[PDB]
Amino acid sequence: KPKLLYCSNGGHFLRILPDGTVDGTRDRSDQHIQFQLSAESVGEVYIKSTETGQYLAIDTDGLVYGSQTPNEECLFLERLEENHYNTYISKKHGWYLGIKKNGSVKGTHYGQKAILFLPLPVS
Q: Residues comprising the binding site for heparin?
A: 9
**Binding site: residue ranges?**
9
Whether 74 contacts 55, CB under 8 Å: yes
Name the DSSP letter for residue 9: T
Query: What helix, strand, coil percent values describe the chain, rounded to 5?
Result: 0, 45, 50
